[PDB]
């Protein structure tokens with residue numbers, strides 16, 4: 106599913122991401138923009154042989170099982186393919202674990218490089234939320 110910007114904001118808000126671990130909604134929408142371009146089916150192979158999955162490009166080294174990432178964990182207890190669904194519940198629940206792991210949203214390198222410190226409220230402008 107390719108979400109609209111405000112469509113995704115509303116779903117992330119409904120699932121409790123607005124100020125989860127202190128991160129406003131615009132931070133989450135900005136991260137999804139630059140991780141997946143709001144496409145739930147996005148996948149990207151990393152140099153370490155892990156893969157990132159879904160709207161927030163959650164990685165198979167720690168967070169989900171894809172059966173092809175040696176020595177990895179599955180701390181969200183889900184198959185990585187569940188992160189590609191049109192329903193973002195699994196991606197949000199797992200994202201809550203990731204942002205709780207110690208480094209906040211810096212876990213998403215694209216958030217750190219493209220969203221952190223920017224006018225992230227712009228990402229929810231116009232939305233009826």
Ligand SMILES: [Cl-]
Nearest residue numbers: 129130131226
């Ligand atoms: Cl915001």
Ligand SMILES: [Cl-]
Nearest residue numbers: 127208209210
């Ligand atoms: Cl933090």
Ligand code: NA
Nearest residue numbers: 165169177178
């Ligand atoms: Na894994």
